[PDB]
């Protein structure tokens, strides 16, 4: 299946194609030995990323992936041995096939697992903005609105830049378009919310009945912004 993320694709596509399969099989010990060295290094980096992370999901999912490419590389190292003895060995032929297949899967798994880690980081940036929207209803003075704008202003900015950088990476197009729209809606809606609050606060500090009205446009805007951010979160996970 299609590797999502322009990065996973450049790593795995060339060899995913090749893995789409007679007589003589040349002597593979030199090349298979370079696979074996590289997979040792991958497992190395894996173990490191595990002890170094604070993500619980990454800790339980990444190891089973090193192991899978590790045992798959074993099958490749052994298939070479065998093919050297009998170039026409049908056994050996299959270990090589499954060996390579295992290496493709595990590596892919490992990266799918690492990609999920990065998505959670992003998800948490969103949840931060979602939290801070729920605090909108408590701003009642005009100087407390200034505090608010000061924190949420830059916060929206960080979210925008980082969703933007994320979408450019996906290799699915509808997913890319869903994100971009949703980040646009939320960005357009920020000055609307401030204006909404600015109206509430004024209508409060002056007492003018149209405060029933102001409070519900404020709320409608908070809701529309929240509905969208949850949509960003959903899409992030495909």
């Amino acid at each position: 299946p299609v590797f999502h993320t322009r990065t996973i694709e450049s790593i795995l596509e060339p060899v995913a194609q090749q893995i789409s399969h007679g007589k003589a099989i040349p002597d593979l010990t030199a090349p298979v030995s370079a696979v074996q060295a590289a997979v040792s290094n991958l497992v190395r980096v894996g173990k490191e990323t595990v002890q170094t992370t604070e993500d619980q999901i990454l800790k339980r999912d990444m190891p089973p992936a090193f192991i899978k490419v590790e045992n798959a590389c074993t099958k490749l190292v052994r298939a070479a041995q065998m093919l050297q003895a009998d170039p026409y060995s049908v056994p050996a032929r299959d270990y090589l096939i499954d060996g390579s297949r295992g290496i493709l899967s595990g590596t892919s798994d490992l990266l799918l697992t690492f990609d999920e880690a990065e998505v959670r980081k992003i998800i948490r940036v969103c949840k931060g903005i979602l939290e801070y929207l729920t605090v909108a209803e408590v701003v009642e003075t005009m100087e407390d609105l200034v505090t608010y704008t000061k924190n949420l202003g830059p916060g929206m900015t960080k979210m925008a830049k980082m969703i933007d950088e994320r979408q450019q990476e996906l290799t699915h197009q509808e997913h890319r378009v869903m994100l971009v729209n949703s980040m646009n809606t939320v960005k357009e809606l920020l000055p609307v919310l401030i204006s909404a609050m600015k109206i509430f606060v004024t209508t409060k500090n002056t007492k003018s009945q149209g405060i029933e009205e102001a409070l519900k446009n404020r709320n409608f805007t908070v809701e529309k912004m929240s509905a969208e951010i949850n949509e960003i979160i959903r899409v992030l996970q495909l």
Partner: peptide, 21 residues
């Protein structure tokens, strides 16, 4: 991350085995 470069070094290595059939 270092993860990507290591994975690529296994993807490349493996290609060289297969390009020998």
């Amino acid at each position: 991350x270092x993860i990507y470069x290591x994975a690529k070094x296994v993807x490349x290595x493996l290609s060289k085995v297969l390009x020998x059939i």
